[PDB]
Amino acid sequence: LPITLQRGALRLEPMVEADVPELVELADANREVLQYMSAPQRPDWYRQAIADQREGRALPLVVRLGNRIVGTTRFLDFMPALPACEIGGTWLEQSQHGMGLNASMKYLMLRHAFDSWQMVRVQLKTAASNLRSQRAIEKLGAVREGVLRNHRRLAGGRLDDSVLYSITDHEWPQVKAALEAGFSG
Amino acid sequence: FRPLPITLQRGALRLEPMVEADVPELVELADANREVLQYMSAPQRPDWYRQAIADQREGRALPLVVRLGNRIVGTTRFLDFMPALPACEIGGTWLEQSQHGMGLNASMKYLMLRHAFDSWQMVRVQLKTAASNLRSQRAIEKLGAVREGVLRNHRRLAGGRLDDSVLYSITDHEWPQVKAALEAGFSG
Ligand SMILES: CC(C)(COP(=O)(O)OP(=O)(O)OC[C@H]1O[C@@H](n2cnc3c(N)ncnc32)[C@H](O)[C@@H]1OP(=O)(O)O)[C@@H](O)C(=O)NCCC(=O)NCCS
Ligand SMILES: CC(C)(COP(=O)(O)OP(=O)(O)OC[C@H]1O[C@@H](n2cnc3c(N)ncnc32)[C@H](O)[C@@H]1OP(=O)(O)O)[C@@H](O)C(=O)NCCC(=O)NCCS
């Protein structure tokens, strides 16, 4: 079920139709940085996420920094029998790269999934050509499970592999510690 | 790619669209084959079939019944469609014990992979199975599918126990060799 997460200036809130135009304008202003994503420039990428929420398939979130939209992220691919899910669909405007915002986002969402949803597995995947995203994920301590061939298209249509990672509930203390270590340097 | 229902045929072997009327016989046969189905989640649960039939309405799965001489002998399905690529999974496969090692699996996979790669023009077909299920692993390896890795805490076994998944796939560039190896095992 839907949730709103916050930590200081950062707020993760359910995505609504009213957010779509500002997200698309921001993505297009940041198009260079978003080349590894599928279609961040398309309104229907955001609306399909809102529709997926209706069908219980996704929880799309808008990232606000001091009340300003700076990007998006989402829970998806729920496996209720386990329970397990994915954090995916993440992007931030360039000026937030390196600022610790991703780490705060991942901490809030991962804490929710493990502590509140009692997940046994949270997975994350990224393009094999997207080295900065791989490093961000590796910094979490997520375990690299393998390379999935022909598993995504990049923004300009090119086929790429995906790298798949996960974190188990057993591993959560480890990951929580590493994120909290970053908060405080 | 359009996820439309199809019948696939080879000799006396037919893969036919699964329908509601089939579910009781499937569940009855799975119950008679409990011992061989212990690594799957829910082959003995009618809802596992019903759910795929429902998902087909929305384009998200194509469940199939395996008939040999018009006799139900097991099941398999296409699922996890990725339309942008396009890509899919072959999963939910089981046969009654009496058909293990009798060549039906290779025929079924040839038919499904041919549809996926030649008609749907897929770039990726994936297959996955429990880390505990070594017979399935060896049968997927015999196809030539490439082992991509182990997914932790990713499934439950029939009785409820958490296990890992081994994930494999076949790409469009690998299909020609997969197809030819399968045909090297067939007559004509
Ligand atoms: C950048 C983004 C992933 C969010 O994270 P972020 O704040 O940049 O993350 P980080 O700050 O930890 O930076 C990532 C790292 O990449 C490093 N980096 C990695 N590969 C590099 C390379 N080839 N060249 C130069 N620098 C590289 C950077 O030094 C940095 O790591 P560091 O802290 O060790 O110095 C994301 O918004 C993005 O902009 N677009 C695509 C999103 C995506 O990939 N989604 C996949 C599914 S969610
Ligand atoms: C998965 C399945 C369709 C494979 O069909 P099959 O006809 O049994 O496949 P094969 O006999 O060609 O291959 C299995 C291989 O593993 C061998 N094998 C059998 N038991 C084994 C075991 N515990 N450990 C390792 N290998 C084993 C078989 O001898 C054979 O190898 P070989 O032909 O080289 O000698 C069938 O076994 C089945 O329905 N199993 C129960 C349902 C199931 O588990 N499905 C998994 C869904 S992912």
Ligand nearest, relative to CA of residue A61 = 1
The answer to whether residues A108 and A7 touch, using CB atoms and an 8 Å cutoff, is yes
Ligand 2 pocket, residue B76 CB under 6 Å: no
Interface membership of A131 toward B (CB under 8 Å): no
A185 in a known ligand binding site: no
Chain B residues whose beta carbon lies within 8 Å of the beta carbon of residue A121: 151-154
Cβ neighbours for A63, distance < 8 A, ≥ 6 positions apart: A10, A11, A12, A69, A70, A71, A72, A73, A92, A101, A105
Nearest to B154 among A84, A149, A152 (CB): A84
Closest approach of chain A CAs to the CA of B111, in angstroms?
A: 21
Method: X-ray
CA of A116 to the centre of ligand 1 (A): 28
CB < 8 Å from B in window 12-71 of A: 38
Resolution of the experimentally solved model in angstroms = 1.8
Indicate the angle between helix axes B175-184 and B134-143, nearest 10 degrees: 100
Q: Does A166 touch chain B if contact means CB atoms closer than 8 Å? A: yes
Residue A81 contacts B where some CB pair is shorter than 8 Å = yes
Q: Is A168 exposed, middle or buried (0-12, 13-18, 19+ CB in 10 A)?
A: buried
Q: Structurally, how many domains does chain A consist of?
A: 1
CB of A128 less than 8 A from some CB of B: no
- Inter-chain CB proximity B146 and A143 less than 8 Å: no
The closest of A183, A155, A165 to A45, measured between CA atoms, is A155
φ/ψ of residue B146, rounded to 5: -90, 135
Which structural domain, as residue segments, surrounds residue A181? 1-185
Distance in Å from the first CA to the final CA of chain A: 33
8 A C-beta contact, residue A72 and residue A63: yes
* Closest chain B residue to the Cα of A123, Cα to Cα: B151
Local structure of residue A155 (DSSP, 8 states): T
Outline where DSSP puts E strands in chain A. Answer: 5-7, 10-14, 58-65, 68-79, 84-92, 121-127, 143-153, 159-168
- Which tokens sit at B63? 């469940």
Nearest atom in ligand 1 to A126's CA: 46
